[PDB]
Symmetry: C3
Subunit: 167 residues, 3 copies
């Protein structure tokens, strides 16, 4: 019934990588290229993409919803252009989660002006549990997570109607 | 192994996911490894996944 | 059937004006003939041992 957005990984903590160049025309905002606001598209800095080792411990008292993703490029040339490492990986781990994502390079038809793909993943981070991210490229690093502050009875209702100011 | 027995056989195996590349060489000495299992119906290839995980 | 190798076939539904791309440096079972869905309707896959009876 209610979320509470918290910053688990600040955008300014990515010193060794480029964090403010992950934009594209497919996600415009007031005429400028942008991206999803709750994740960060990290780009290689000075033609180098050092291996990332970041961890977050859920110091809160509630379940945490963490969203991250992987970027699948179009060809080998774009992979070197953005991350400089021909073969990359994203390894994510918690008490229960054990995940290693490998980017899939394939020629694809353009959708919304882009041929690449953004595959997003998630997990529920229980209190006192920690999530560990290791990646040397193609990492869509999280910035904001969701705190489950009130559970209850709800549903996802499919309807074209909108608010009617009634009870 | 060949199932010379007359009844169905339930066979169990597994794979180890280490903590880091140091433990991979510490225990097996080969950084890239695989496990391939094949039967008349099964065709499976397992690759270890290295990640930092909480202690259980 | 006298072979220890295996063929793993995959399929997708290609919508009009969409493009399917293939890149492979080996082990590729390339398509030659596709199928057009020229008519959709109420059908079923019936499991039976019988055959045609030339009736209605």
């Amino acid at each position: 019934n209610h979320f509470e957005k918290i910053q688990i990984i600040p955008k300014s903590s990515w010193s060794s990588h480029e964090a403010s160049l992950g934009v594209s025309s497919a996600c415009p905002y007031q005429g400028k290229s942008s991206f999803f606001r709750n994740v960060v598209w990290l780009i290689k800095k000075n033609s180098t993409y050092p291996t990332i080792k970041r961890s977050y411990n859920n110091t809160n008292q509630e379940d945490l919803l963490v969203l991250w993703g992987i970027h699948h490029p179009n060809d080998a040339a774009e992979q070197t252009k953005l991350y400089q490492n021909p073969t990359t990986y994203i390894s994510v781990g918690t008490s229960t989660l054990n995940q290693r994502l490998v980017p899939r390079i394939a020629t694809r038809s353009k959708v919304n002006g882009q041929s690449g793909r953004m595959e997003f993943f998630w997990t529920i981070l229980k209190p006192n549990d920690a999530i560990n991210f290791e990646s040397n490229g193609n990492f869509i690093a999280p910035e904001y997570a969701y705190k489950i502050v009130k559970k209850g009875d709800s549903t996802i209702m499919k309807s074209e109607l909108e608010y009617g100011n009634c009870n």
